[PDB]
Amino acid sequence: SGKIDKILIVGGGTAGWMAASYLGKALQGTADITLLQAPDIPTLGVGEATIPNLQTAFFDFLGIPEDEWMRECNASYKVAIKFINWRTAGEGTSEARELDGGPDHFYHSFGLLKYHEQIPLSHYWFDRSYRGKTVEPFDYACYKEPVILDANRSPRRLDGSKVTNYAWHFDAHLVADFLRRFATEKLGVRHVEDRVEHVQRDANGNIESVRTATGRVFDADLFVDCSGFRGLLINKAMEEPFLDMSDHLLNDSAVATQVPHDDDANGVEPFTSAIAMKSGWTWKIPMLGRFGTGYVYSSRFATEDEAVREFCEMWHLDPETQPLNRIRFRVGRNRRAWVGNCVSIGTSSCFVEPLESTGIYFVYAALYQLVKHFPDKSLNPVLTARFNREIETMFDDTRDFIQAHFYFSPRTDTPFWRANKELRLADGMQEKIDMYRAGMAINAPASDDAQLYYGNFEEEFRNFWNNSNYYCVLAGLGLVPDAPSPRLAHMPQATESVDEVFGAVKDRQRNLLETLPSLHEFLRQQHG
Amino acid sequence: MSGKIDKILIVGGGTAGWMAASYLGKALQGTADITLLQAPDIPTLGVGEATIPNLQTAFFDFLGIPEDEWMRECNASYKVAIKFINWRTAGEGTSEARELDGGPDHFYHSFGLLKYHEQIPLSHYWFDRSYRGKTVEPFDYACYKEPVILDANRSPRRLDGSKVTNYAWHFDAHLVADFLRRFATEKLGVRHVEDRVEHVQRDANGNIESVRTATGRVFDADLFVDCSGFRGLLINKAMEEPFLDMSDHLLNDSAVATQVPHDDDANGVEPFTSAIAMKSGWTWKIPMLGRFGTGYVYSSRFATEDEAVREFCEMWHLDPETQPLNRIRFRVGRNRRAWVGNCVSIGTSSCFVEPLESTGIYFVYAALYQLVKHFPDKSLNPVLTARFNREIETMFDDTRDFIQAHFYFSPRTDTPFWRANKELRLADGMQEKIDMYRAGMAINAPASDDAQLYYGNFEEEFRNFWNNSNYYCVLAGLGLVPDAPSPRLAHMPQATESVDEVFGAVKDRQRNLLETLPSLHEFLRQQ
């Protein structure tokens, strides 16, 4: 019996310091926290893209205003993910190829999808498209974002007012540093820079203590494994099996670097770019004066050298001198994220390519669940089982959504793209696709007020990938319902007034394209 | 083949039938021809129906009917909660609460919303204090302002009309059915045909082609809605869809009921439904205007119809030999599938569970909302049908489990009935909720403690129908509490300290409303 008195976090990367901060804040003065991390070879800041609830679910919980952390972490703004060349054959290039009279790209914005008589706008759009009343792409018809993004507009007016939902772009290293200073200076977390050499377990199989290379021994009531892909505690010591899911996702590697950028001459893109390649895709994460970029590929379809070549050749970099990070990652999740008195947080727990910026999200989402299911020293099995259930559905739902990006691409030009169609969608994903094809909304939000949504975590965790997200991706790639939603034929009054809505977004976007200052313009002011 | 549905035939003209005619008529106004076939049934006494808040927001508001309009025509009263009497003490079936630990044996399950404190339901702070011996006050009186004002039969609205608490209604279903029949036929163009179904003609695909009536008339349609009640004329008889008897979770399958005249001037009116525990079941009391409906829901396995009639009549001091009574044998459970082919079952033809938590009418409009949401065209995409069936299935089973818990967790062991309930098994899904409750976790806590956003948005409420508040009201009320306080609270000394004024605010609302609110009767008079 008794509450948890000591917590030991193993690992000092982004996950480790977010854990120290979140737990240090949530348990302020009722638990002694120590973070243990081995100083080793650091990597290039290849950039990180995020989602809106980073501020409401994480930084707001710590009591850190947006302005404070993003200025210290030299962050930029992200309004969407621009998918480039996912529908056309060809080599890996930063320039969109031509498709049906236009550039091959489509957006997945954080922007809200307007309802109309209890029905998502997406459904009205497809009805008109299917009956030939429109030729306009889904994103440009239902969202105001596409047009102001094509013009690299800021998501905020010079006076600071927000005109749309947005997330952030930043170097993970700087954020980890910011959080380390915060956790140690303001939350009392003890930082020990040493390397774990031996983990001692008791007869119940729980971790008793960890011994470092210098011979120091640390004990705790609860151990948080933030050791990364190695899973030092969860996989190695506790022997919990990692479940590989490469049967759903072929990508398992990446070659990444940071590239200098002339913002003055080219402005700053208010979005992350996902550029389709021959054996994967490449991310582009604009930051201040540079952009992080990385080629995510499948080791089964391209050798590291081929990836290095393809990657450097698209950014016109020199393979021989360009500093490059060659990464190999495991895809999937542990059979159980929390076993005994060991909780895995971060890549030690689960991982999927950054195609939808879920990496950091998985960390604070898991920390939120750990606090919600926080135990005492008796370690009630029920709290552990529930936490584990929340993690598996969180991961598996994203895994499926991401697989859909590859499964439904029309490309058949390379072994990679053709191989993605050979895979099997999880039963849950197949059911969602069937629903989509039948004209149904997928996980429509009970309400269409982003505020409530992006402001209330419980509500967002339960409706993470909603109808808007699915339409952007599926419709963007070319997968559309078999026929218009049956209910529409019974709503003449609705399908008539819907035009007011479509016109409203057209005006909305015409006005923003004229009154909004470029992202660069805003960033200058924003950043001293 | 893919033109929209053009014709719909509703078989059955009771409450479910006219609710369906009204909802579909409103939803598909002018794009579908609706006909309802209704045959004369032997009249029954209006024994009363209790409801929940979303009846107005999810049903009448959808139809565009103001609360005052249907209430006045259906002579309805107000319901603020369900008051459970004598569920924790041994004894005969009586209308008087027995004594338990210094007070009457009752607890309320009201519509009030549990206030969150530092992101944690007030229920957790209450149990923490109770467990540590800091309080001995019951969960409902400590966390809700309703109990105090209900003990005084207060109105949910001030004389000026201002609402002070969430509430639902009490009324004679027959009157609501008539109100809707008139609304649908007069305002929505629904065609009413008084005839009896004699034969249902199906095609080689197993779908219903048409139904032939006793007069020889043949009615064809694209979609058929079975609102024929327990006999499930279409869904069970014609479509042969199996019915899942769930008597392994619910022992009650019968009822004896009547309507009793009441002098509201002399006794006032109770703003709540009473659920009175009996020896082999429980009895409802639904206050209406100048009378109250009441019925003893019992298990034929533990009481004969005669014994049920005697226990029921004696409790109300009525003559068993001459009191007009409605003897009913329920069909408890649900169809394997609510919608099969082009036949959708709505109402008791679809599913039924004893009215212990007032879900009868709710199941009807909730299903109609789900039907429109998954509305098909002539191709009848099987995915719409499957998704519909999953929604209905979970809606029912979750309620089945919730209701079973009322009996499973009662501390009574005085009769074979109460003892047998403890011998049944809880469904795995329910056992998991109990494991969570015992571990100090909230059970399906609402995304937010905003009652309006809750009872105002159906999609929101449907998904979180039985929430943490509902579970604590019933479980803690019966006496089942967590094994220990939520471990999180030990790490929140500031919160467990500042919550003392959240409980104080409740006490202030209890005291102020008790001193300023008129009686339910007073408010009813002025209306």
Ligand SMILES: Cc1cc2nc3c(=O)[nH]c(=O)nc-3n(C[C@H](O)[C@H](O)[C@H](O)COP(=O)(O)OP(=O)(O)OC[C@H]3O[C@@H](n4cnc5c(N)ncnc54)[C@H](O)[C@@H]3O)c2cc1C
């Ligand atoms: C004892 C009892 C207590 C209840 N208490 C509550 C409560 O407190 N609160 C609450 O919300 N709900 C309560 N309910 C549920 C409520 O009564 C029902 O939800 C509602 O009234 C709908 O009944 P129904 O239309 O499904 O079936 P029925 O009333 O059985 O209707 C059958 C209909 O089908 C028709 N029919 C049958 N065969 C044919 C044929 N061959 N041709 C033409 N027509 C045919 C009949 O004419 C009739 O109109 C209670 C139910 C019972 C039995």
Ligand SMILES: [Cl-]
């Ligand atoms: Cl009001």
